[PDB]
Amino acid sequence: PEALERLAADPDREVRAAVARRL
Amino acid sequence: PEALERLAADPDREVRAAVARRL
Amino acid sequence: PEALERLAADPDREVRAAVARRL
Amino acid sequence: PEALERLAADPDREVRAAVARRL
Amino acid sequence: PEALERLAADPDREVRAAVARRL
Amino acid sequence: PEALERLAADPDREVRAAVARRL
Amino acid sequence: PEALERLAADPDREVRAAVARRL
Amino acid sequence: PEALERLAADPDREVRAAVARRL
Amino acid sequence: PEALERLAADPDREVRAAVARRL
Amino acid sequence: PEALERLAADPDREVRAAVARRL
Amino acid sequence: PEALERLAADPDREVRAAVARRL
Amino acid sequence: PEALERLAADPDREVRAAVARRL
Amino acid sequence: PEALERLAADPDREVRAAVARRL
Amino acid sequence: PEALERLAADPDREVRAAVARRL
Amino acid sequence: PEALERLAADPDREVRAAVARRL
Amino acid sequence: PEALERLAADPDREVRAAVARRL
Amino acid sequence: PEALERLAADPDREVRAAVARRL
Amino acid sequence: PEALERLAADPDREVRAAVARRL
Amino acid sequence: PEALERLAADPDREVRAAVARRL
Amino acid sequence: PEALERLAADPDREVRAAVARRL
Amino acid sequence: PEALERLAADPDREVRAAVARRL
Amino acid sequence: PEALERLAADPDREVRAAVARRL
Amino acid sequence: PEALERLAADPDREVRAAVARRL
Amino acid sequence: PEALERLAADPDREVRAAVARRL
Amino acid sequence: PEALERLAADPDREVRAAVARRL
Amino acid sequence: PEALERLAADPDREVRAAVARRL
Amino acid sequence: PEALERLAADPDREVRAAVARRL
Amino acid sequence: PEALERLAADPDREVRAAVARRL
Amino acid sequence: PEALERLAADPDREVRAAVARRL
Amino acid sequence: PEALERLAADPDREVRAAVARRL
Amino acid sequence: PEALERLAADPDREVRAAVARRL
Amino acid sequence: PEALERLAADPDREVRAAVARRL
Amino acid sequence: PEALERLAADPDREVRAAVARRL
Amino acid sequence: PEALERLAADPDREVRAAVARRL
Amino acid sequence: PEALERLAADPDREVRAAVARRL
Amino acid sequence: PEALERLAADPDREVRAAVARRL
Amino acid sequence: PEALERLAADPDREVRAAVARRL
Amino acid sequence: PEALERLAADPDREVRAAVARRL
Amino acid sequence: PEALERLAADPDREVRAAVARRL
Amino acid sequence: PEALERLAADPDREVRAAVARRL
Amino acid sequence: PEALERLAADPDREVRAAVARRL
Amino acid sequence: PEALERLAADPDREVRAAVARRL
Amino acid sequence: PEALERLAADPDREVRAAVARRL
Amino acid sequence: PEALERLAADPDREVRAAVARRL
Amino acid sequence: PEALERLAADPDREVRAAVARRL
Amino acid sequence: PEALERLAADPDREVRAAVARRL
Amino acid sequence: PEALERLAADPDREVRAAVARRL
Amino acid sequence: PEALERLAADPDREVRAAVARRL
Amino acid sequence: PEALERLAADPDREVRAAVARRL
Amino acid sequence: PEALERLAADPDREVRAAVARRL
Amino acid sequence: PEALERLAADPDREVRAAVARRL
Amino acid sequence: PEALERLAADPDREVRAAVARRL
Q1: CA dihedral sign, ordered B21, C3, C9, C15
Q2: Which of H10, H21, H22, H23 to probe by mutation at the J interface, max J CB count within 10 Å?
C-alpha cells in the first residue's frame, strides 16, 4: 500500500532501516 | 485488515519496525 | 477472532511486536 | 478452546507474546 | 486432557508460554 | 501413562515446560 | 520398561526434562 | 519504486547501510 | 541389554539425559 | 543502478563498508 | 562386541553420552 | 579390523566419542 | 566494475577490510 | 585481479588480516 | 600464490595469525 | 608447505597458538 | 608431523594450551 | 599419543586445564 | 585412561574444576 | 565412576560448584 | 544419586546455588 | 524432589535467588 | 507449586526480584 | 496469578523494576 | 493489564524507566 | 497508548531518556 | 509521532543525546 | 528529517557527539 | 550529507573525535 | 573523503588519535 | 595511504601509540 | 612496512609498548 | 622478525613487560 | 625462543612478573 | 619448562605471586 | 607439582595469599 | 589436598581471608 | 568441610567477614 | 547452616555487615 | 528468615545500613 | 515487608539514606 | 509507596539528597 | 510526581544539587 | 520542565554548577 | 536551549567552568 | 557555537583551563 | 581551530599546561 | 603542529612538564 | 622527535622528571 | 635510547628516582 | 640493563629506595 | 638478582624499608 511511504518519513532509525530492508 | 494501519501510527519503535517488516 | 484486536491495544511492546508479526 | 482468551488477559509479557504468535 | 488447564494457571512464566505455544 | 501427571506437579520449571510442550 | 519411572523421580532437572520429552 | 532514492539521501547511517545492503 | 540400567545410575547428568532420550 | 556510485562517495564509514560488501 | 561395555565405564562424560546414544 | 579397539583406548575424548558413534 | 578500485584507495580502515573480504 | 597485491602492501593491520583471510 | 610467503614475514601479529589460520 | 615450520619458530605467542590450532 | 612435539615443549602458556586443545 | 601425559605433568595451570578438558 | 585420576588429585583449582566438568 | 564422590568432598569451592553442575 | 543431598548441606554459597540450579 | 523446599528456607540470598530462578 | 508465594513474602530484595522475573 | 499485583506494591525498587520488566 | 498505569505514576525513577522500556 | 506522552513530561531524566529510546 | 520533536527541545542533555541516537 | 540539523547546532557536547555517531 | 563537514569544524574535541570515528 | 586529512592536521590530541584509529 | 606516515612523525604520544596499534 | 622499525626507535615509552604489543 | 630481540634489550620497563606479554 | 630466559634474569620486577604470567 | 622453578626462588614478591597465580 | 607446597611455606604474605587463591 | 588446612592455621590475616574465600 | 566452622571462630575480623561472604 | 546465626551475634561490625549482605 | 529482623534492631549503624541495602 | 518502615523512622542518617536508596 | 514523601520532609540533608537521587 | 518541586525549594545545597542532577 | 530555569537563578554555586552539567 | 548562554555570563567561577566543560 | 570564544577571553583561570580541556 | 594558538600565548600557567595536555 | 615546540621553550615549569608528559 | 633531547638538558627538575617518566 | 644513561648521571635526586622507576 | 647496578651504588637515599622498589 | 642482598645491608633506613616491602 501507501503506508510504506508513511513509514518512509517516520522519524525513527530502526523503522526506516527495516523499511529499506523491504524497500 | 485495517488494524495494520493502526499499528502504523503506534508510538512505539519495535511495533513499527515489525510493521515495516510485514508492511 | 477479535482477540487480536484486543492484543492490538495491549500496552506492551513485545505483544504488539508479535502482533505485527502476525498482523 | 476458550482457555486462549484466559491467556489473552494473563498479566505476563511472554505469555501474551506467544499468544499473539498463535493468536 | 484437562491437565493443560491446570498448566493454564501454573504461576510460572515459561510454563504458560509453552502452554500458549500448544494452546 | 499417568506418569505425565506426576510430571505435571513436579516443582521444576523446565520439567513442566517440556510437559506443556508434550501436554 | 519401568526404568523410565525411576527416571521420573531422578532429582535432576535435565533428566526429567528429557523424560517429559519422551514421557 | 523511487522511495529508495529518498532513502539514499536520508541523513541516517543505519538507513543508508541497509539501503546499500539492498542497493 | 542390561548395560542401559548401569547407565541409569551413572552419576552424570548428560549420560542420564541421553539415557532418557533413549529410555 | 547508478545510486550505488552515489553510495560510493557517501562520507560515511558503514555505508561504504556495506557498499564494498555488495560492490 | 564387548568393547562397548568398556566404553560403559569410561570415566568421560561425552563418551558415555554417545554410548547411551547407541546403547 | 582391530584398529577400532586401539581407538577404544585412545586417551582423547572426541576420538572415543566418534568411536562410540560407530561402536 | 571499477568502483571497487575506488574503494581500494578509500582512506578508511573498515572499507578496505571489507574490500579485501571481497577482493 | 592484481588489486589484492596492492592490498598486500597496504600499511594497515586489519586490511592485511582480511587479505590473509582470503590470501 | 607467493604473496602468502610475503605475508609470512610481515612484521605484524594479526597478519601472521590469520596466515597460520590459512597456512 | 614448509612455511608452517617457519611459523613454528616465529617468536610470537598468537602466531604459534594459531599454528597449534592448525598444527 | 613431529612439529607438534616441538610445540609440546614451547615455553609459552597459550601455545601449549592450544596444543592440548589439539593434542 | 603419549604426549598428552607429558602435558599431564606440565607445571602450568591452563595447560593442564585444557588437558582435563580433553582428558 | 587413569590419567584423569591423576588429574583428580592435582593440587590446582582450575584443573579439578575442568575435571569435574568432564568427570 | 566413584571419582565424582571424591570430588564431592574436595575442600574447594569451584570444584564442588562444577560438581553440582554435573551432579 | 544421593550425593546431591550431601551437596544440599555443603556450607558453601556457590555450591548450593548451583545445586538449586540443578535441584 | 522435596529438597527444593529445603532450599526454599535456606537462610542464604543467592541460594533462594537461584531457587526462584528454578521455582 | 505454592512455594513461590512463600518466596513472594521473603524479606529479601534479590529473591523477590527473581520471583518477579519468573512471576 | 494475582501475586504480581502484590509485587506491584512491594516497597522495593528492584522488585517493581523487574515487575515492570514483566508487567 | 491496567497495573502498568499504576506503575506509570509510581514515584520511583527506576520503576518508570523500566516502564518506558516496556511502555 | 497515550501513557507514553505522560512519560514524555515526567520530570525525570532517566525516564525521558528511556522514552526517547522507545520514542 | 511528533513527540520526538518535543523531545528535541527538552532542556536535558541525556534526553537529547538519546534523541540523536534515535534521530 | 531535518530535526537532525537542529541537533547539529545544539550547544551541547554529548548531543553533537551522538549526532556525529549517527551523522 | 554535508552536515558532517559542519561537524568537521565544530570547535569541540569529542565532536570531532566521533567525527573521525565515522569519518 | 578528504575531510580525514583535515582531521589529520587538527591541533587536538584525541582527534588525531581517533584518526589513527581509523587511518 | 601515505597519511599514516605523516602520523608516524606527529609529535604527540597518543597519536603515535594508536599508529603503532594500527602500524 | 618499515615504518614499524622507525617506531621501534621512537624515544617514547607508550609508543614502543604498543609496538611490542604488535611486534 | 628480529626487532623483538632489539626490544628485548630496550632499557625500559614497560617495553620489556609488553615484550614478555608477547614473548 | 630462548629470549624468554633472558627475560627470566632481567633485573626488573614487572618484566619477570609478566614472564611468570607467560612462563 | 624448569624456568618456573627458577622463578619459584626469585627473591621478589610480585614474581612469586604471579608464579603462584600460574603454579 | 610439589612446588606449590614450597610456595605454601614461603615467608611472604602475598605469595601465600595467591597460593590460597589457587590452593 | 590437606595443604589448605595448613593454610587454615597460617598466622596471617590475608592468607586466611583468601582461604575463607576458597574455604 | 568442617574447616569453615573453625574459620567461624577465628578471632580475626577479615577472616570472619570473608566467612560470612561465603557462609 | 546454623553457623550464620552464630555470625549474627558476633560482636564485630564488619562481620554482621557482611552477614546482612548475605542475610 | 527472621534473623534479618534481629538485624533490624542491631544497635549498629553499618549493620542496619547493609540491612536496608537488602531490606 | 513492613520492616522497611521501621527503618524509615530509625534515628540514624546513613540508615535512612540507604532506605531512600531502596525506598 | 507514600513513605518516600515522609522521606521528603525528613530534616536530614543526606536523606533528602538520596531522595532527590531517586525522586 | 510533584514532590520534586518541593525538593526544588528545599533550603539545602546538596538537595537542590542532586535535584538539578535529576531535573 | 521549566523547573530547570528556576534552578538557573538559584543563588547557589553548586546548584548552578550541576545545572550547567545538565544544561 | 538559550539558558546555557545565561550561564555563560553567570558571575561565578565553577558555573562557567562546568559550562566550558559542556560548551 | 561561538560562545566558546567568549569563554576564550573570560578573565578567569579555571574557565580557560576547562576551555583548553575542550578546545 | 586557531583559538588554541590564542591559548598558546595566554599568560597563565594552568591554561598553557592544559594546552600542552591537548597540544 | 609546531606549537608544541613553542611550548618547548615556554619559560614556565608546569607547561614544559605537561609538554614532556605529551612529548 | 628530537625535542625530547632538548628537554633532556632543560635546567629544571620537574621537566627532566617527567622526561624520565617518558624517557 | 642512550639519553636514559645521561639521565643516569644527572646530579638531581628526583630525576634519578624517576629513572630508577623506569630503569 | 646494567645501569640499575650503577643506580645500586648511587649515594642518594631516594634513588636506592626506588631501586629497591624495582629491584 | 643478588643486588637485593646488597640492598639488604645498605646502611640506610628507607632503603631497607622498601627492601622489606619487596623482600
Answers
A1: negative
A2: H23
Find all residues with CB under 8 Å of AN16, minimum gap 6, and list them. AN7, AN8, AN10, AO7, AO10, AO12, AO15
Pick the residue of AY6, AY7, AY16 with the most AX CBs within 10 A to test the interface with AX by mutation: AY7
Q: Per the CB < 8 Å rule, is M13 touching AE22?
A: yes
CB contact set of H7 (below 8 Å; sequence gap of 6+): A8, A16, A19, A20, H15, H16, H19
Among the listed residues AG1, AG17, AE5, AV5, the one whose alpha carbon sits nearest the alpha carbon of residue AF6? AE5
Q: How far, in Å, CA of D12 to CA of K9, rounded? A: 47
CB AP21: neighbour CB atoms within 10 A?
16
How many Å lie between the alpha carbon of Q19 and the closest alpha carbon of chain P? 5
AJ6–S contact, CB cutoff 8 A: no
**Selection from M14, AJ8, Y22 nearest residue Z7 by Cα:** Y22
Cβ proximity of AP13 and AP5 under 8 Å: no
Minimal CA separation from F5 to chain E, in Å: 7
N16 Cβ contact partners less than 8 Å away, ≥ 6 residues apart: M20, N7, N8, N10, O7, O10, O12, O15
Contact predicate U13/V12, CB 8 Å? yes
* Consecutive H or E run containing AO18: helix AO13-22
Burial of residue X17, with CB atoms counted within 10 A of its CB: 0-12 exposed, 13-18 middle, 19 or more buried: buried
* CA angle centred on AD14, ends AD13 and AD20, rounded to 5°: 95
Residue at Y19: amino acid letter:
V
Determine the residue of chain Z that is closest to B6 in CA distance.
Z1
Residue reference for cell 551541547: AB12
Q: Which residues on AS lie below 8 Å from AR18 (Cβ)?
A: 18
Instruction: Indicate which of C12, C14, C19 best probes the interface with B, i.e. most B CBs within 10 Å of its own CB.
Output: C19
Q: Are O12 and P12 in contact (CB under 8 A)?
A: no
Which chain AV residue lies closest to AU23 (C-alpha atoms)?
Answer: AV4
DSSP letter at AU3 equals: H
Contact of AR17 with AR2, CB cutoff 8 Å: no
User: Could you tell me if Q22 lies within 8 Å of chain AI, comparing CB atoms?
Assistant: no
Which residues lie closer than 8 Å to C15 by C-beta, 6 or more apart?
A: C7, D13, D16, D17, D20
> Cell for AS10?
553567570
Q: Give the CA distances from residue AZ3 to residues AG10, AI11, AP14, AX4, in Å, rounded to whole numbers and listed in that order.
A: 20, 10, 55, 21
Can you read off the three cell numbers belonging to residue D19?
499468544
Spatial neighbors of I15 by CB under 8 A, at least 6 apart, are I7, K13, K16, K17, K19, K20
Q: How was this structure determined?
A: cryo-EM
- Of the candidates Y5, E1, AZ22, the one whose C-alpha atom is nearest the C-alpha of residue AJ12 is AZ22
Residue J2 at interface with chain H, using a CB cutoff of 8 Å: no
Return d(Cα C12, Cα AU7) in angstroms, integer: 54
CB atoms within 10 A of CB Z16: 26
Under DSSP, the state recorded for T9 is S
CA–CA gap between residue AC1 and residue AY3 (Å, rounded): 58
**What resolution in angstroms does the PDB record give?**
4.4
- C partners (3+ CB pairs within 8 A) are B, D, Y, Z
Chain P contact present for AG6, CB below 8 A: no
Instruction: Search chain T and give the residue with CA nearest K9.
Output: T1
Best residue in J12, J19, J21 to probe M by mutation, most M CBs within 10 Å?
J19
Among all residues of chain X, which has the CA nearest to that of Y2?
X23
Of W3, W12, W18, which is closest to V21 when you measure between CB atoms?
W18
What is the rounded radius of gyration, in angstroms, for the C-alpha atoms of chain AY? 7
Chain C interface includes Z5 (CB < 8 A): no
